[PDB]
Ligand binder design. Structure first.
Ligand code: GTY
Lengths: 209, 209
């Protein structure tokens, strides 16, 4: 049976899980919901068989999941990409939590009203952050070496969002600015980004500042 | 040698990790900073050997980690308590994300300003969230059934800090209210709480409204 991921019609926390699936050339079908359809959601929210009703959600035969990460860490984990050995396993978890610090650092205020004023406070911490990746991919093709892991999209995402809040901000980081290319290079992702699927704007909710 | 886990002198994201440890009777020694000691932190912040400098951190021979989860998922992992199978691995990653949804619902508000302007707006959809557990802890002893996993503790604290703001809250949720006891009903855990190692408060931090 074909798996069923589900989430609004934005990028939010699903965007990365899309590419992880896109890059694995996996077959799956999307179940979206648009800015008003909040009803049909509040409708099936408890009709699907999810222990913890929430969006996004993933359903194949075996499981019925809800919790963005537990859903990518599954798809990935299915195809041994998680690392078979504590250290290496914690090593992605460390690359996970980080990419979501740069990723949540927008989401927070992205809603928290008066954006302009706050953005800055944040944008001046983004460097101690973005930095660490410039000096990671400094002698590594992708975050975790030779092969593509799953954080290697979570970040590609974080970036893909920031060049929208201050397009320059990457520059001092060639490795990163280049990074974003090496990814969009991966044929499978190409197929996608120039597809009819690909959901362009928005990055947050149809509310967000 | 003896492992080092470091954080500020509060509970924040470490509290859980400490119990996971405490529960496993594991040996480890603390390294905590106070509300003023920010310097000494900003000091060794890059002298340790951490690929991604941040608080808290965990160091023990093989790995030097940052990222709160990556840490706990490591201690745990290192004892098999993470489930050796995809489904049962994502199951715990489902619980994880959801216990954090309660804690991350009291820390972008408590960092906002006068919390009284961003309190209940979430204390709104806190129920469905709490509820979902009331219902998971229906037939099961621990969030995962027969044996203690790591999201348990997580929860245990999530809840612990929740009583704080407005005691009553856990009422229509006796399975829960009951739960907490079942936890601090574990010998080992009981051995901490009463002791001179458990940090009283602030459970949150020193910038709590
Ligand atoms: C944890 C705070 C983050 C808040 C911002 C979330 C932005 C994405 S839009 C989806 C939103 N819920 C979630 O994303 C669930 C959070 C969960 N942490 C996850 O990672 O999946 C919702 O309105 N779901 C429909 C509903 O159940 O009301």
């Amino acid at each position: 049976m074909s798996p069923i991921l589900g989430f609004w019609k934005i990028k939010g926390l699903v965007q990365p899980t899309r590419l992880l699936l896109e890059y694995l050339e996996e077959k799956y079908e999307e179940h979206l919901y648009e800015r008003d359809e909040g009803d049909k959601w509040r409708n099936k929210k408890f009709e699907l068989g999810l222990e913890f009703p929430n969006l996004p959600y993933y359903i194949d035969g075996d499981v019925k999941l809800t919790q963005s990460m537990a859903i990518i860490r599954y798809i990935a984990d299915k195809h041994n990409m998680l690392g078979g050995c504590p250290k290496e396993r914690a090593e992605i978890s460390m690359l996970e939590g980080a990419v979501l610090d740069i990723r949540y650092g927008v989401s927070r205020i992205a809603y928290s009203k008066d954006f302009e004023t706050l953005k800055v406070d944040f944008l001046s911490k983004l460097p101690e952050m973005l930095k660490m990746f410039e000096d990671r991919l400094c002698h590594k093709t992708y975050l975790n070496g030779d092969h593509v892991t799953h954080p290697d999209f979570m970040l590609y995402d974080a970036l893909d969002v920031v060049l929208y809040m201050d397009p320059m901000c990457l520059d001092a980081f060639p490795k990163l600015v280049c990074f974003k290319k090496r990814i969009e290079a991966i044929p499978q992702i190409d197929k996608y980004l120039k597809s009819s699927k690909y959901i362009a704007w928005p990055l947050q909710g149809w509310q967000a500042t």
